[PDB]
Design an enzyme around this catalytic site. Structure first.
Site, short mmCIF file in Angstrom:
data_model
loop_
_atom_site.label_atom_id
_atom_site.label_comp_id
_atom_site.label_asym_id
_atom_site.label_seq_id
_atom_site.Cartn_x
_atom_site.Cartn_y
_atom_site.Cartn_z
N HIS A 1 -1.86 5.61 1.81
CA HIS A 1 -2.24 4.50 1.00
C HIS A 1 -3.19 4.48 -0.02
O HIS A 1 -3.35 4.09 -1.04
CB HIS A 1 -2.63 3.46 2.06
CG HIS A 1 -3.36 2.26 1.61
ND1 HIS A 1 -2.55 1.27 1.00
CD2 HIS A 1 -4.83 1.98 1.33
CE1 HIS A 1 -3.48 0.38 0.61
NE2 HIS A 1 -4.54 0.70 0.56
N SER A 2 -4.42 5.37 0.29
CA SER A 2 -5.43 5.59 -0.51
C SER A 2 -6.26 6.80 0.09
O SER A 2 -5.89 7.54 1.06
CB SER A 2 -6.47 4.43 -0.54
OG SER A 2 -7.27 4.47 0.86
N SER B 1 -9.49 -6.30 -6.03
CA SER B 1 -9.18 -5.98 -4.77
C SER B 1 -8.50 -7.09 -3.78
O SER B 1 -7.56 -6.54 -3.07
CB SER B 1 -10.27 -5.49 -3.87
OG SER B 1 -11.26 -4.67 -4.60
N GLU C 1 -8.03 15.00 -5.84
CA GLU C 1 -8.79 16.09 -5.68
C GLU C 1 -10.42 15.89 -5.91
O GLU C 1 -11.15 16.27 -5.27
CB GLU C 1 -8.56 17.44 -6.27
CG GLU C 1 -9.49 18.59 -6.18
CD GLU C 1 -9.45 19.11 -4.68
OE1 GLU C 1 -8.49 18.82 -3.98
OE2 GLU C 1 -10.49 19.71 -4.32
C1 LIG Z 1 -8.43 -0.65 -3.16
C2 LIG Z 1 -8.47 -1.12 -1.54
C3 LIG Z 1 -7.40 -2.29 -1.30
C4 LIG Z 1 -7.24 -3.40 -2.52
C5 LIG Z 1 -7.39 -2.88 -0.04
O1 LIG Z 1 -8.42 -3.47 0.22
C6 LIG Z 1 -6.20 -3.13 0.60
S1 LIG Z 1 -4.54 -2.55 0.24
C7 LIG Z 1 -3.73 -3.30 1.46
C8 LIG Z 1 -2.46 -3.05 1.96
C9 LIG Z 1 -1.35 -3.65 0.96
O2 LIG Z 1 -0.24 -3.41 0.87
P1 LIG Z 1 1.10 -3.85 -0.14
O3 LIG Z 1 0.94 -5.02 -0.84
O4 LIG Z 1 2.53 -3.29 0.42
O5 LIG Z 1 0.77 -2.62 -1.27
P2 LIG Z 1 0.90 -0.95 -1.25
O6 LIG Z 1 -0.69 -0.33 -1.12
O7 LIG Z 1 1.24 -0.81 -2.66
O8 LIG Z 1 2.06 -0.51 -0.18
C10 LIG Z 1 -4.62 -3.99 2.23
C11 LIG Z 1 -4.31 -4.85 3.70
N1 LIG Z 1 -5.96 -4.03 1.70
C12 LIG Z 1 -7.10 -4.71 2.25
C13 LIG Z 1 -7.10 -6.47 2.07
C14 LIG Z 1 -6.60 -7.24 3.07
N2 LIG Z 1 -6.71 -8.41 2.52
C15 LIG Z 1 -6.61 -9.13 1.41
C16 LIG Z 1 -6.73 -10.53 1.02
N3 LIG Z 1 -7.07 -7.98 0.39
C17 LIG Z 1 -6.95 -6.64 0.59
N4 LIG Z 1 -7.24 -6.08 -0.28
K LIG Z 2 -5.77 -9.20 -7.07
#
Ligand SMILES: CC[C@H](C)[C-](O)c1sc(CCOP(=O)(O)OP(=O)(O)O)c(C)[n+]1Cc1cnc(C)nc1N
Ligand SMILES: [K+]
Ligand SMILES: CC[C@H](C)[C-](O)c1sc(CCOP(=O)(O)OP(=O)(O)O)c(C)[n+]1Cc1cnc(C)nc1N
Ligand SMILES: [Cl-]
Ligand SMILES: [Cl-]
Ligand SMILES: [Cl-]
Ligand SMILES: [Cl-]
Ligand SMILES: [K+]
Ligand SMILES: [K+]
Ligand SMILES: [K+]
Ligand SMILES: [Mn+2]
Ligand SMILES: [Mn+2]
Lengths: 390, 336, 336, 390
Positions: free
Chosen positions: A286-287, A157, A71
């Site tokens: 997801h976020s 990240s 929120e």
């Molecule tokens: C806080 C913002 C987050 C960390 C973000 O940037 C993410 S999270 C994400 C999906 C990861 O999916 P997952 O490992 O199944 O994990 P969950 O979110 O728990 O399902 C991506 C593609 N991303 C983008 C991403 C793409 N490529 C790399 C190497 N790192 C990323 N963070």
């Molecule tokens: K990491």
């Protein structure tokens, strides 16, 4: 008999490809059913009342915090947030099976592990707000937590980078003769990264006391697992690297606990890696930047880790509606107290933008810091200075 | 916001920057049956909506999700391009381009040269969101163009607006060299202007003088062009100084002649970019200009850049080379 | 050869550059029980003999082979260093550092900053053979230092000789920041001189003026220091020109003060490096010097670098910025 | 029944880790014994005489070329070389099972595939010498071959980078409706790279008609496979990605042929990847820069692919000592003719250092080319100009 150095095997005189077993994959270990009933008495860990109450209070306190901070984000009071809905059991089940000083590397959706280790509400808040109480000095986006005291390495990240790092820390622990195990959490999408193949192979070859803990929650942002891999999930990859592997019902805190407890015991005794794939479901978006209705519950109402644990408590006579009500009130109060405090604290001094780039401050970086200070002396009215310390 | 966006080829429609990218992609697949688009989460339309509607229009074999693996996305894109098919890869944030650095620098950039032109990956384009976004912190804010500028064999291109983005993106897609196209994500929704519906091209390796001036040359790219445009306004009003404002557009190979021609006229140069100062691309422009325009330069060339730190969360307003930092540097350079 | 090598702290022995590296490593493990060395083929002594005898002396748990996976080697090294143990990773050629680029730039360099100093990987050093070798072609010749120079939070260090290599390597190993130490491989056997048996340190971020001069400043690093030393000799003899010859040693953070102090005296600067011109580290030095020494500069700063191509096999003699190319550039700059 | 999106599986009510089968790994498929005898008549491909003679002549011509060029390197006439000793069967066995236009990506130790596709001796030589006949314009180190006419993508030094590339080319082929398969060769050390995990997973998920062909020859330079991985070699990794996998005796040209032929048929029909791990042994040094006695035959004298094939020819009445002698003479003559020609050719014009960096020549790159031309006009006596064309 074959003599080749690269494998140990017999000859075969018929051409036969090895087919993957994907339809009947590695079975899902489960201890209690969706009504909180123990299925097989010989698998019941009989955790004591106080410990099971801590698992439950930890997951619901996390849930209360998630609701409030989600929120806060929607209102623009924090810049970003990510909830843990549906995955609270994987965090607390596994953390409870670790020793206090086992080192944790994570991804971003494991805040329950910190909660279980008693990370203060004030510090979760301080990181999300980037305020003066944040030991991370407000430098990272929200939910990128870290705590040296509780052996929880700062989240970053870039996905999967912590996997080979966790392996190196496990190799160092072995050398130090630590009786310590490293656990490394990551999602099923992160497991597609090259660094996962790096980490798994190194941990086997170099004989490291590490548990790889994959939360398989069905989606990586919009991408369903049908587009993520075609083998039998992540657990089926482990034996290929020589890693002892298991799949568990990640919505069953007892299944997660049993698997993690035995992995830890064996990883530390034997200096060998273990892999646990916890099957769950990402109930939340997801976020805060995601509206998940764009690409996809039964899970929330028919198979939630918190609900299942609550049913178990009731069956033992360990919880009731009156306690549930009082705890709901107390936890809201505790979260709201931390929230108010965090919002009133100033942000850190803008000087802190320059420190810790190197351990020391290089003279040319100090020149840049000085340039900012002169700049703000002249143009400071154009900056949000009243919000920042000093 | 730290900037303000200000806004022939047939019918136009108002488009923001993400829409101009979709328009470019849609025109590309319509006219090139080999073209495919792929990367993380592109099927449902992408995390910044750049591919909305394209899978429904063109088919699941042509717009599709990959596994979460950047070194794979780029290696895969190179292999498509080796066969001659147009490969438009997405990397979800420029901050996560680094796992693919070896595929870009050791493979894509060198593919044609090392084969004597027996093979190439000219039909590869890599597009990725780029630059600060107010709260992106260390890993959703980066500007990696200077890392790539030191690699012969790739082109690196950054637009400043929706009209610019569609024209430059079509040029990248059609160029016969592997290209990285960095899309300033803060502009995805913020910048909107008229964009031709039908395809058109803007040339690569060509800077654009967007405002003529006589006293000083200012050079930037991406969102920072809007900052220096405002700085030009501040200088006119406060100092009576006439600034020539140039958008570089292509990082490599860069338009050396347009920048030098300007500095030969004005005698002064200020270059600005969000990326950190040390090793930043302003160093290459400043060195080159000094070498070509030594006799015309009336003052040291100024570089107003991000500080040499990682990109912070809460300190963003203090980190970026904003209009006041650029203005103050200009003022001193004018006084020199 | 395109160069000629020319040659207090207790007893010394004659050592070539690979031996000086072994001596540094041996002294490091002797005095630091946490220290380990690992990477591809290091157990049998390494493909350039830099680790000969160390596994036998210190044990298989301390000097060991990894799987063939650079992103793993660096991620693994970071994790060792996170626990406080000294991690000395090898990357077999600098050309193959790129798979680890994300672990270096997004992780190692940012580890301390992004945690507020709750965690760090200061006790990591990455060492790798570097620079041309006569016939190394595209992937055994590269000089990647400018790629790393744009990344705050790492140090990048390149020695010119055996004495320099051991002192700088010990400093990297003991420095509390992740360091990349590039070993010029053409010098591994070619350069030999007296080196102290016992450990000693040479400071990082400090250039060395190896020959005083009054008419022009010349800056290089690695093998190229020997080229500019010869160029200084050619200039004295042929032109009666006095050259100040400086070895930069550390790429970042670099010794800005020593270079500027020199150029303030001489009024002229030539920088040379094997890496390609565009985006090369000479651009950063030239820009900075122009900014600090504008009133002292009598001629444009010259950069004599590799061409903006991949590094060729058969054309190597025509590609490198050899003594004749440096000399000719100097001659023109003197005439300016 | 479990409901999780990430896997298809039953529940299990007992905690059981999955152990890897490393001691009894995936068996090694073999068709003929070390005496060239067919073991199981139903597996005999009954290749016609002319084809089997081509397999044999190809491997021995490669062997003759390797011996000469290794010597040329030792003398400093070429800068580098890498032999194919012990692995000649994997190259020709697999190449013979491909269609002529199937696209090949390799690593560097697959020159037999080019030989089998009739790549001229003059062009192998031209690349190693970097002379004017080299279509690669002398830019890459020796043995980095490529041939657009014979669909053999130019070799590059960075290990495993071709793996995800080969997958992309296979996806493109599928779209084009090619009836074509891509084959991608790599060593067991290269398989440790992140790019291998990238390629394997993409090929499965995206359903690509590709054969991954791993030469497992026991060593990656000095590193034995015991330090490279701990699972059951590379073949055991394939099922984890959902890839049909097989291990073959790489010293048996018929086993390699049968496996490759069936993989090709199924990969092209089904749009699915296949993995073949060919067990062999690196008889030679890693390269001319390696002295392998520093870290380690039975293989050369008791289990060599060429010897085995020769025994088979004899058993059919398809070869004898007189033919062996004549072919030894003819092949030496052919290699020596190419060698002499290659040594007498000039190197290419130094201008060629600047072309093909981009398709076109950027004006600033042309300025650099011009600067070289002016430089050589003045200082040309100091350069090896008489060796270079024009
Ligand atoms: C806080 C913002 C987050 C960390 C973000 O940037 C993410 S999270 C994400 C999906 C990861 O999916 P997952 O490992 O199944 O994990 P969950 O979110 O728990 O399902 C991506 C593609 N991303 C983008 C991403 C793409 N490529 C790399 C190497 N790192 C990323 N963070
Ligand atoms: K990491
Ligand atoms: C022609 C020179 C060759 C290409 C060279 O540089 C190589 S070869 C090699 C061993 C590879 O072993 P392998 O895959 O088992 O293959 P074989 O040599 O056939 O046994 C390494 C570590 N290297 C070094 C190396 C390390 N890391 C990367 C990413 N690429 C490399 N080439
Ligand atoms: Cl303002
Ligand atoms: Cl964003
Ligand atoms: Cl070498
Ligand atoms: Cl000479
Ligand atoms: K292109
Ligand atoms: K260090
Ligand atoms: K390759
Ligand atoms: Mn997920
Ligand atoms: Mn091998």
């Amino acid at each position: 008999k074959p003599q080749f150095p690269g494998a140990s095997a017999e000859f075969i005189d018929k051409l036969e490809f090895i087919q993957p077993n994907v339809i009947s994959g590695i079975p899902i270990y489960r201890v209690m059913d969706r009504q909180g009933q123990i299925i097989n008495p010989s698998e019941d860990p009989h955790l004591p009342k106080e410990k099971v109450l801590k698992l439950y209070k930890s997951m619901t306190l996390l849930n209360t915090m998630d609701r409030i901070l989600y929120e806060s984000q929607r209102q623009g009071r924090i810049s970003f947030y990510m909830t843990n809905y549906g995955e609270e059991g994987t965090h607390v089940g596994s953390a409870a099976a670790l020793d206090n000083t086992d080192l944790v590397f994570g991804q971003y959706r494991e805040a329950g592990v910190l909660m279980y280790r008693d990370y203060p509400l004030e510090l979760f808040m301080a990181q999300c707000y980037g305020n003066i109480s944040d030991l991370g000095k407000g430098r990272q986006m929200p939910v990128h937590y870290g705590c040296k005291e509780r052996h929880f390495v700062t989240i970053s990240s870039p996905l999967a980078t912590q996997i080979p790092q966790a392996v190196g820390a496990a190799y160092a622990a072995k050398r130090a003769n630590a009786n310590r195990v490293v656990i490394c959490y990551f999602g099923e999408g992160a497991a597609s990264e090259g660094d996962a193949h790096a980490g798994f192979n190194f941990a086997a070859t170099l004989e490291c006391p590490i548990i790889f803990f994959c939360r398989n929650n069905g989606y990586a942002i919009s991408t369903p697992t049908s587009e993520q891999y075609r083998g039998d999930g992540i657990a089926a990859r482990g034996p290929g690297y020589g890693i002892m592997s298991i799949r568990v019902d990640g919505n069953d805190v007892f299944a997660v606990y049993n698997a993690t407890k035995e992995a830890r015991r064996r990883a530390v005794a034997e200096n060998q890696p273990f892999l646990i794939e916890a099957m769950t479901y990402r109930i939340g978006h997801h976020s805060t930047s995601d509206d998940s209705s764009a690409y996809r519950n039964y899970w929330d109402k028919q198979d939630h880790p918190i609900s299942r644990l609550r049913h178990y408590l009731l069956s033992q006579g360990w919880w009731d509606e009156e306690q549930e009500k009082a705890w709901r009130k107390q936890s809201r109060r505790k979260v709201m107290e931390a929230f108010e405090q965090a919002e009133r604290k100033p942000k850190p001094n803008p000087n802190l933008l320059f420190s810790d780039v190197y351990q020391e401050m290089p003279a040319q970086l100090r020149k840049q810091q000085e340039s900012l200070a002169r700049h703000l002396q002249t143009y400071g009215e154009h900056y949000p200075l009243d919000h920042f310390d000093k | 916001a730290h900037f303000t966006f200000q806004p022939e080829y047939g019918q136009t429609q108002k488009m923001n920057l993400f829409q101009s990218v979709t328009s470019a992609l849609d025109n590309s697949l319509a006219k090139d049956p080999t073209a495919v688009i792929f990367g993380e989460d592109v099927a449902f339309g992408g995390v910044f909506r750049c591919t909305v509607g394209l899978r429904d229009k063109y088919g699941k074999d042509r717009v599709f999700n990959t596994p979460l693996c950047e070194q794979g996305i780029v290696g895969f894109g190179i292999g498509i391009a080796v066969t001659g098919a147009t490969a438009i890869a997405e990397i979800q944030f420029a901050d996560y381009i680094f796992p693919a650095f070896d595929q870009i620098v050791n493979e894509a950039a060198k593919y044609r040269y090392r084969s004597g032109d027996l093979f190439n990956c000219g039909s590869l384009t890599i597009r990725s969101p780029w630059g600060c976004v107010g709260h992106g912190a260390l890993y959703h804010s980066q500007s990696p163009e200077a890392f790539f500028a030191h690699c012969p064999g790739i082109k690196v291109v950054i637009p400043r607006s929706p009209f610019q983005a569609k024209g430059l993106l079509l040029s990248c897609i059609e160029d016969k060299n592997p290209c990285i196209f960095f899309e300033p994500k803060i502009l995805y929704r913020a910048a909107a202007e008229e964009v031709p519906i039908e395809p058109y091209n803007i040339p690569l390796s060509q800077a654009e003088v967007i405002q003529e001036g006589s006293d000083v040359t200012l050079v930037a790219w991406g969102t920072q062009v809007h900052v220096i445009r405002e700085v030009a306004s501040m200088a006119k009003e406060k100092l009576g100084v006439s600034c020539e404002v140039i958008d570089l557009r292509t990082i490599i190979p860069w338009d050396v002649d347009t920048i030098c021609k300007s500095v030969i006229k004005t005698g002064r140069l200020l270059i600005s970019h969000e990326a950190p100062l040390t090793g930043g691309f302003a160093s290459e422009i400043s060195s080159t200009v000094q070498e070509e325009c030594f006799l015309n330069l009336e003052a040291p060339i100024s570089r107003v850049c991000g500080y040499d730190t990682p990109f912070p969360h809460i300190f963003e307003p203090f980190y970026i080379p904003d209009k006041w930092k650029c203005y103050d540097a200009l003022r001193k350079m004018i006084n020199y």
